[PDB]
């Protein structure tokens, strides 16, 4: 199948921070999931990855040097990006995947969200 993703069309950073909320087409709750934020039209850089597994506290992280924070919420995940640089102004795309229970589930490429860091 294909999960749905609804995200804000734009987000103006306040104090070089913003809140990236991703609205999904999925679950009341409890499965093993890997949420992802990617920056760029060529979606190169993966800004953040909030991992979940039923219970076990949400494990957010970044391999790219972003001060990322993640908050769960049923059919949504919110990426709290801090210390964003003005040169990081770009289109960010949300991604969601379930790895258990099977089968593998993925999202249909969203319309994205332009983050304008002033």
């Amino acid at each position: 199948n294909k999960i749905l993703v609804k995200q804000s069309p734009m987000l103006v950073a306040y104090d070089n921070a913003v809140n990236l909320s991703c609205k999904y087409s999925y679950n009341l709750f409890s499965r093993e999931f890997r949420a992802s934020l990617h920056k760029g039209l060529d979606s190169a850089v993966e800004v953040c990855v909030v991992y979940g597994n039923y219970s076990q506290q949400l494990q957010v992280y970044s391999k790219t040097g972003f001060n990322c924070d993640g908050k769960l919420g049923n059919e949504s995940v919110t990426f709290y990006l801090q210390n964003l640089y003005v040169n990081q102004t770009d289109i960010y795309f949300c991604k969601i995947e379930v790895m258990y229970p099977p089968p593998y589930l993925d999202n249909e490429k969203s319309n994205g969200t332009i983050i304008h860091v002033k």
Partner: antibody, heavy 119, light 108 residues
Framework: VQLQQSGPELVKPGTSVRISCEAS????????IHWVKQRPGQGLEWIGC????????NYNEKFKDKATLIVDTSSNTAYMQLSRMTSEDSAVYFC?????????????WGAGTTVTVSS | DIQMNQSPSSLSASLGDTITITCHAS??????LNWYQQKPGNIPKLLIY???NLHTGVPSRFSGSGSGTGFTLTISSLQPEDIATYYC?????????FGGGTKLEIKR
């Protein structure tokens, strides 16, 4: 959580052998399977990885042609194909995994498969 | 890709000695670099992941620190059982890359 690897194999210079590595003791589709080669006396280098589930794969440009990563979700087996071999292919190939969500490192290694490419 | 430059290519120390190894990275890997131990003819085992995070079961005599470009592994109170070769690997960017390894000899 064991990682069983194939026995040593002798390969005649030119041919292609496909070693294996079957997981057991955890959820196969919740981890990447990485392959790394260690030449005798030398350090070890990352060949490529594969993620059973969406069958996505990643290769190191130093092994683009030879290395072909295949997966077997039924027998929890991860295969590694080394095509067109030479005395530069002779080394011990290791099997290991990485957590899919928290992809930070390789904590479970196979015991390896020594490969000789002598005629 | 990224280059791994381990420092002591080899090193001999006595029982109880608190040695130290170094691994410099060509560019910024942040805190994504792990350390491994591989005894003679044996399989390599994870010692330290994420710069300072020890792996379950690794004694506390093993320590690790660093960020960005500089990284270091410290083993205090050496034991014969620590005779092995130590590799540094980065887990930030594909392709993953390990170091040259460092050999250790417990002097008796």
């Amino acid at each position: 959580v064991q990682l069983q690897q194939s026995g040593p194999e002798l390969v005649k210079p030119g041919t292609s052998v496909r070693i294996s590595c079957e997981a057991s003791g955890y959820t196969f589709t919740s981890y990447y399977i990485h392959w790394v080669k260690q030449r005798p006396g030398q350090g070890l280098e990352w060949i490529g990885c594969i993620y059973p589930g969406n069958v996505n794969t990643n290769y190191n440009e130093k092994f683009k042609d030879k290395a072909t990563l295949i997966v077997d979700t039924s027998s929890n087996t991860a295969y590694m194909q080394l095509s067109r071999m030479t005395s530069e292919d002779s080394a011990v190939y290791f099997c290991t995994r990485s957590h899919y969500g928290l992809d930070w490192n390789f904590d479970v290694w196979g015991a390896g498969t020594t490969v000789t490419v002598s005629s | 890709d990224i280059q791994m430059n381990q420092s002591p290519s080899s090193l001999s120390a006595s029982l109880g000695d608190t040695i130290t190894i170094t691994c410099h990275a060509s560019q910024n890997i942040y805190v994504w670099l792990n350390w491994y131990q591989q005894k003679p003819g044996n399989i390599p085992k994870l010692l330290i992941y994420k710069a300072s995070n020890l792996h379950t079961g690794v004694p506390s005599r093993f320590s690790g620190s660093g960020s960005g470009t500089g990284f270091t592994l410290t083993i205090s109170s050496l034991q014969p059982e620590d005779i092995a070769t130590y590799y540094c690997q980065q887990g930030q960017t594909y392709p993953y890359t390990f170091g040259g390894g460092t050999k250790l000899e417990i002097k008796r």
